[PDB]
Amino acid sequence: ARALRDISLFNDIRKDQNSVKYIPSLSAYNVFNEFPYYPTSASQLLDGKLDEFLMLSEQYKSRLPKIRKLGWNRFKPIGINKTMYELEMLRSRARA
Amino acid sequence: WQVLGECYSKTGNKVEAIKCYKRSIKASQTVDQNTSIYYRLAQLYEELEDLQECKKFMMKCVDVEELLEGIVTDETVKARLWLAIFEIKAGNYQLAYDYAMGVSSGTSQEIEEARMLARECRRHM
Amino acid sequence: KYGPLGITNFITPYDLCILILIHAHCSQDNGISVPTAVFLRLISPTRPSLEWNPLLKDNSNLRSSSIVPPPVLPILDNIIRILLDDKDGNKIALTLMGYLEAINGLDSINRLMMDLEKNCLVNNYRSMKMRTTSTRRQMTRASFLGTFLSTCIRKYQIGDFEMRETIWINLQNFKTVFKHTPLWLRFKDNVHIQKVKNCLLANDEISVEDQQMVEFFQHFNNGNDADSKTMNEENYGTLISIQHLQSIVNRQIVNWLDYEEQSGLVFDLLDTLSLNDATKFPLIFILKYLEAIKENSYQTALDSLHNYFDYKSTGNSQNYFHISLLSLATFHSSFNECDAAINSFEEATRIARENKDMETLNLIMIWIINFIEVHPEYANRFYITVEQIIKYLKNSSDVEDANIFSNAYKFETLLSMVKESKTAEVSSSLLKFMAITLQNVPSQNFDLFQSLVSYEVKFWKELGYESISDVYEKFLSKTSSSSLRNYDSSIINQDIKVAFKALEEDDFLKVKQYLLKSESLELDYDQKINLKYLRVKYLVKIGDYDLSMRLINQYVKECCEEVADSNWRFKFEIESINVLLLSDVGIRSLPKIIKLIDEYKEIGNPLRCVILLLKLCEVLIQVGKSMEAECLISCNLSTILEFPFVRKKTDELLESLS
Amino acid sequence: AVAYATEKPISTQKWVIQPLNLISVFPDDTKITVKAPEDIAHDIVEWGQFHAGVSSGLRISKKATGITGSWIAFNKPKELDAYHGGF
Amino acid sequence: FINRELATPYLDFVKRLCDEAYGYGKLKSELEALFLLGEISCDLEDWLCNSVGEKNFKRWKYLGCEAYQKTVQILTLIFVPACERIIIYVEKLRAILQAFSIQNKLSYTSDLTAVEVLLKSSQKLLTMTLNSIIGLGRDETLFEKFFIWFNDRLHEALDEDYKLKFQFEDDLYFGYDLLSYFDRILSKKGTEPSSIIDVKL
Amino acid sequence: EWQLQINITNKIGGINGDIWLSRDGRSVKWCIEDQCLRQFTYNQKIIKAGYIDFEKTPDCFVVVLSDIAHVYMLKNGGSTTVCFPFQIGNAFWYANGVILERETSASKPIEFDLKHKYITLTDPMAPFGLISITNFQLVLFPSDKDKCIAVFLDRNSKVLRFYYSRILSSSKDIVLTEISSLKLPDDIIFTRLSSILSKLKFLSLRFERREGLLIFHEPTHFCKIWLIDLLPDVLDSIPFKIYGNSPQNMIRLENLKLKEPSRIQAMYIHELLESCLILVSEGQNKEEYKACLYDPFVKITSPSKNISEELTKQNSLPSLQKLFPYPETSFTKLCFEAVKYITSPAFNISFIFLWQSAYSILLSRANDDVVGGLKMEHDAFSLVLSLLILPIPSSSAQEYQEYKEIYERDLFQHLKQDSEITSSVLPRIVIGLHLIREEYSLNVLCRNEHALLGQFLRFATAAMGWPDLWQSYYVPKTFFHPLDEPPSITKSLYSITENSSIPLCPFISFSRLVATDTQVELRITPRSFKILGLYELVHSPNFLPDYVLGILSSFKVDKDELQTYPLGILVPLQNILKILEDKLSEVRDNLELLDRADLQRCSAIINSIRSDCKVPLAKNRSSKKPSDIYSILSEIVKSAS
């Protein structure tokens, strides 16, 4: 892959003379949601082959905070008519 | 068997494709299902340049229309038009006239092709 | 050491073995530093990705400039034999042996994993110099071992408890396998294990009550065989990741293609895949394909080839249909189908256009004439003439080609040599091909370097200077052959040279039996002509000339129409001269020889001119006019001794004149 | 008309159409460049492009093979203009 | 020419930058520790910043690349065409003397062992030059892989914010080539001026 | 271990190839001698291996499994595969197809079908056909197209049925009609179908129109041959086929005329010798086996006493086949063929026997003197006729001692005791060999062996006391000779010529003393016939140079044959063509015998258009400074962009 320019000789002469779409694979489709997995970056695509370990690493990393993120938004306790999302919002404004 | 014939036909192996379709014809349980194979089988003979041999298969594909109380299907429309055209070259205008009239219930281009052929053979009749 | 094989995306028992050693090296409490050679043999196969196309490209970058030891199978027997070799390696090996005895539970495995992440591994070197209070060596993420340990740590937190549970079943299954080996008996007790085991087993926090039931929990799960064992699902004997398996197979096919390896162990283990590892690892199919060609199996080879291109095409996001056809096209040319390969190749061009990608077309064109080079008789059948490609490839680009020009000029040199062009152009064209090939690395591009030697040894041999040819002949590789040209072609080629030697030594029985094999073998065109030419020379020796004369003119006539090979036209032609003049009638050859003399004077090939002089001299002495033949040979005696293989005919003629 | 059947296609090789230059050079060598549509009617320039494209397309010999429906699509400039219409 | 202009200036730059500043035996062990663990001692970080620096690093690459890429050119464009021409001339030299040994039929004969020795010696050369050209081919591969990693360590020591562009995951045997370069450049045989090619032979 | 197969293919004479089966029916290798060609492995049991043709002129190798057949095209094409209605027991090759036998019984109950168990297929694609039988396992079938006899044996009856099967093509494909029957010996007891067929051995022989079937059983030493004469009138008779009536004269069953017929180990067919000769292996001790030759039709047998112990195995068959000698050069082949055409088959086959014995003894006597070549067979040929013509010397003579090993042989004794054959056949052989020498005189390329024939023929004349004219015909300057004058093309050729001093003379060729059509004479002396017909036509008073091109075309005369003539005939005809190189410009067919390419190319162009064919374009051989290395390298990088 010297490209004819990494050769010092022909590189010298030239100076003197001057004077990818992605498609899902079968393993990409999962069982629970019909949306197939889409890689985030080309690094996860090993020479056009989807790394099963790499895709399963991002899947674990995504689901991990999702358990922590459970109470945000919709979830509302009894006796408080406001959810915890804007509990931290007003808390942020309290000190600031 | 029919699919194999298409693959051989599309790869320029007309000598083999003839035997492939012939085997398919025997396996068919009903004569009706042979209408599609007969017309295509006749084209390959025309590609092999033996017009006399393709006549016998042309007779069968047209005759299935009569056996099916006038099915009048698309792949017999091209059969009658081609059969009538050759019959003009054979000099038998009377035997070609009835072919044009029987195919007068096809597509827009099919009817006019036979209508003009009917007039030509009618004048020489 | 054998067992069922299965791909695992988790911490294999082999992976902990490196994790054991790296713990000893970094702890620096025992003062044992693992040799750098041991590490570079263990982690390096685990490093991700090498890739290898089936054909159409051979060892372009897979070859290592420095010879590397084979990758190590994930068995404690094989791992120990590496460390054991050193005189002090028993101390290093026993350190690994001691640790594997210390980790008796799943919690102990987590202790090693927790220890490295909190203390050993370090985010960056900027925090290294501030951590001078650490009693253990610390490591950077970007280092050779740092990037490995990060992946290994990542492979531990990526799993649930079922993942950690399979680690400990297999490791004890992996450990107890080594227990029933002769090597374990030699190390049954060495007392260094007890010292190192007690180094880490300390601070157990209990020795009187829990340790009584800790044994019970371990023993009941283990197969004590006192009663019927607790029933559990079948467990694999060996666990390997995709990357490590890739290193083993890539090394095996390369070693097969052309420190001792274990062919029996690797082949046996690879045959026990659960049929789903084969889908995740398509290269197992081609490993059968290479073996199938060795024994020359037709039906078996095709099935494995098709299997490899069904799983690979789906895995590769890039379109690979335009590559599948050529490999099948190459396979057909390998079995001398020839005509069937042409139809398969035609559909490859059409598929390439649909992709609308330029880089693949250069690969298609390169494969075109390489098929033509092996089978020159099919040059007319192609939709592109050979000269059209050379004109394109010469002015293809000035960058991102590298090897295209090295290929392009080599094909011009063959066409020019066959076209019997002036030796002025042939040397210049060969100079271009030689200059670019040696400019880049010739070691990595082993295919073209061998082709250079084959041409140059052929180019200088036709000129008559065996001294130059001998030097380059020592660089020509035997039994290597090339792709898309059978597999027993090398055996046949060595056999032809034996037959020619047998002809010189008057071993007529041997050459006669070989000619029988000739009529029923499937031979390449270049091999065809040699045996076609060998048959003519053998018939001249016997004495029957009516058959030979009718035979030789047929050869040359089809050596000018079927293939425009001028070099083989000349060698056949002079044989017609020899059979005539040997039969005391050489006068008929006079119009033919003189037509070649002035024709080859313009070409300037000194061998061609001199060999015609000897035939001319031999004609003149059988007419009764030896007087002028002596006068002609005397003036040219100086310039005819430079060619070695005509000296024997030259010297023999001198005694005749006396 | 000057080039009727001169160049032959390679099928694999990609065709090229030289764009209209329409720059005049005077013996004083003070180059003057025409630009559309201020200098000339807008329709004229690509009408000339269409005429040049027709000439380029006609340059292929009649007896040339391998020019199937895929070849023209292979030579499509991915952006339709007068040159490709003439071609 | 190559010994005086290409070989010696490159090796002297290596010797002054490594032996005169840090030393050979200590450097080889430390670099392997750097390669495997990334442990940079206080003294070695001084060597990267003060001794090598950015200014000499570019010169090191420039000196090294010409030391190999120009060396292969003179072996292929000069020695091979010359050695072939020597062989053709001695072969013609042998033929002329042999003919006049028969043509004159003079009683006294001149022995041809002198020619034969030159024939084999020149043949020995052409085989021996081709071995070097292949050898310098491997050297270029080891040369480039060394500095693409050495670029990464050097800038990291001088920036503390360098974003590592090259990745070791590109090649699987990347470690073996990187280590093999150290042995060739830092060893007792490497200290000799014939490290690049066997000039004495 | 691998096992070889005896008969695999119908190639009307034989084919060069081997088939190897593994220790189990799971692998087939088409190795030639030692190179493993296409190898096929199967899970099921392999029945047989083919390489047969399929009536469409293919060259395809077919392997038959239990219920699937694979047809791999070797000469050209890919692979095909076919199925069958039911299981197949065995498969037998026949001309243009395969005959399949149904599997009889399997499990141990023994039940079988008899209504129809035979399937005929021509090519894989076409549907199968059914056999036809008119008034029972098939042990052997006539695989070779030339032979036309099938043998059927039914188990319980233990009798054989001999049919005359003829092949019908474009469903009934094959028809059989019974002719005779044979009763097996009571001692022969047969008990796994192939194992039962293994003990019995059958072989197919045919010479001219006579054919014989060889039936052998090693455990009981049973050996008989059934002979039949294929009279063209008798076979074509309608009552003969349908009714099955056969005259009793044609049917005959006889044993072998060997010394110890009850001590035969095994026998095979001589592949190299196409005639009726059969290899016979006999043993006198556990470590020595004697091999001899025997002809079924004519009672002549060859006592050779060749010893071969380890070669008796089937896997060593080719070495045994190559043990016996046959002339493999191109000179003595014509001599043998001339002998066959002029002598009786009985004298012929004994003559090959004597020549083979003479070849063997000389090889033992000659201790690799210099090379060994064509002179080897010529010496054997020359001496064999010498001993046959020279009276036997006394036992005390030195010549008797050197050639004693040929003297006591029974065939020589019979071949000298027969007064009739030595009286008249020997002049015919000498005259024939004189004509082969004379034919050689017209080919300048083979003058060498031409001369050697002269030496022997001179000796033959000295042996027979022929008139001095014949003897002087060879020098530069008691049987009865039929021809008082030697026949020569050259003397006759000068006779048929303008301004010929010699009067008219005919060549009196051997086409009349052979009592056979001119076709058999043509293949022996083609040059003589061509030249005689050529100069019979050109020397006509109404001859013009234009018809010569048609005459050479009709006489199959080419460039190579034209350049091989001992001056004389060559010179005028070449000049005649030189005349045609000037005035011929109209394209008048058969241009290839000239040397003008443009007229040939125009004729090729015209012939293509009439047919609707190779428009070979002439490459412009263009032709100077060599410059330097740098200028070249700069040129290529400049042109690269």
Side-chain angles (χ1 to χ4, degrees), chain C residues 37-50:
Chain C
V38 167
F39 281 148
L40 281 193
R41 187 166 180 178
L42 296 176
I43 316 85
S44 58
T46 306
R47 308 219 66 258
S49 185
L50 176 59

Side-chain angles (χ1 to χ4, degrees), chain C residues 295-297 300 335 337 394-395 397 409 431 436 508 517 520 522 544-545 549-550 553 583 585 588, chain F residues 16 32-33 36-39 41 77 330 371 443-445 447 560 565 570 629 632 635-636 639-640:
Chain C
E295 57 187 48
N296 262 319
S297 299
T300 311
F335 279 12
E337 286 277 7
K394 281 185 57 176
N395 56 11
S397 176
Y409 290 127
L431 173 48
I436 304 136
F508 297 93
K517 290 176 184 181
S520 205
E522 303 218 89
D544 47 346
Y545 307 137
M549 171 55 38
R550 294 191 287 99
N553 82 321
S583 63
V585 178
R588 314 277 213 283
Chain F
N16 301 323
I32 176 168
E33 295 294 327
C36 182
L37 287 183
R38 314 274 184 287
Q39 174 181 359
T41 175
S330 60
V371 166
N443 160 307
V444 70
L445 269 300
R447 63 166 68 259
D560 196 3
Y565 283 122
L570 158 65
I629 323 289
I632 288 183
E635 173 274 308
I636 88 163
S639 56

Side-chain angles (χ1 to χ4, degrees), chain C residues 434-438 440-462:
Chain C
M434 159 168 140
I436 304 136
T437 297
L438 276 304
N440 63 54
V441 277
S443 82
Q444 285 181 352
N445 298 323
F446 180 78
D447 39 20
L448 270 295
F449 183 78
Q450 284 305 313
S451 197
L452 171 63
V453 165
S454 58
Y455 267 30
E456 213 180 24
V457 85
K458 183 167 72 171
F459 160 77
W460 283 101
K461 195 182 306 174
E462 71 156 39

Side-chain angles (χ1 to χ4, degrees), chain B residues 1 16 19 23, chain F residues 123 125-127:
Chain B
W1 278 123
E16 167 74 11
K19 290 180 301 190
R23 160 70 52 96
Chain F
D123 46 348
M125 279 336 290

Side-chain angles (χ1 to χ4, degrees), chain F residues 12 33 148 249 251 270 345 363 379 398 407 474 506 568 574:
Chain F
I12 54 172
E33 295 294 327
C148 304
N249 50 2
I251 303 292
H270 210 298
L363 260 193
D379 290 332
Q398 271 180 315
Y407 289 159
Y474 304 160
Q574 172 76 14

